[PDB]
Design a protein around this nucleic acid. Sequence first.
DNA 1: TTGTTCTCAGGTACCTCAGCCAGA
DNA 2: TCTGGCTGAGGTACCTGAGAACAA
Lengths: 153, 153
Amino acid sequence: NTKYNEEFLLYLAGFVDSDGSIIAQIKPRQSNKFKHQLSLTFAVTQKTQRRWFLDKLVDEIGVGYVYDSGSVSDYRLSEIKPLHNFLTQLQPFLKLKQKQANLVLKIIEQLPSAKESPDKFLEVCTWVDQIAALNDSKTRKTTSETVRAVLDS
Amino acid sequence: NTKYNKKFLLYLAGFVDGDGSIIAQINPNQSSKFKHRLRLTFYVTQKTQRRWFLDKLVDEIGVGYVRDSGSVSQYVLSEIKPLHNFLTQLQPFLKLKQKQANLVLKIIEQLPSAKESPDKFLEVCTWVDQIAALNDSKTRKTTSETVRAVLDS
DNA sequence: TTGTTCTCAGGTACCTCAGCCAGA
DNA sequence: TCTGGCTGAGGTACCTGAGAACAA
Ligand SMILES: [Ca+2]
Ligand SMILES: [Ca+2]
């Protein structure tokens, strides 16, 4: 497990709290046991003009990708393991997104069991609802309620 | 002069590089000796729902004010002295806005003499152009050329 | 079936200026 | 004459979702 220095993590938390995003999503998918796929994402958005600053993040964190769309780029990290390691080290220094990070860490750790029973999956889905509630959510569609009404059949 | 905790400056530097703004402006002023007044401002913008976060800055930096402009609030610091003290301590940790901080610091230290010669004032005004060049400038009107055009007989 | 990569975009929440006015 | 406390806004640059496809 990669260990990050504290000066790196302090600055990064400030940058994440400002321009970053901690995202949990439930994605409709018929081929999945409970008809949905859980998706966790850490994101940093920045004008493509400064894509390099995001590229440095890849190098410095040791993983992730940079995507472009129009005039804006994103560093993204969604691989569960690395995500867990990074977030665990980052969360003590977060101020605006501390709870989201903690909610994500709790979803990750409970993932195995959530895959065994619908009630447990629905439960993890409510933690996802909470992340979205803390975020400035504006176009959310699939929620724990969606999942509940589908399993009720 | 207040000396700030280092953990705090690092976090803050990340937040400033994210949601903050280091700005220099030349304001046409009828009374001012050279027909213009210099304004240096440090801003942190955040949705009014998170005004408390800006309020804590007033407490932690020990100076400045918080204003409401719609659904959005801003922490603002523009008094020269306190601004100089704050920025000189922040600037080593800044990444995206280190240049602007340093140009502002240079302007501040040159303020006494810029009031003397008009060439010196136009000089300071070019350092203002550079801060604006480094920013995502979109609606800037008064520049050093503008001032140049005014100072004539 | 599952984890993940990659792209698009809705709706702001920022950013970075503009300018006034009272007191000093 | 100068400075600092106020306010309003143009034009994005973000945030936080959506969804398709591809391994494994
Ligand atoms: Ca922000
Ligand atoms: Ca930003």
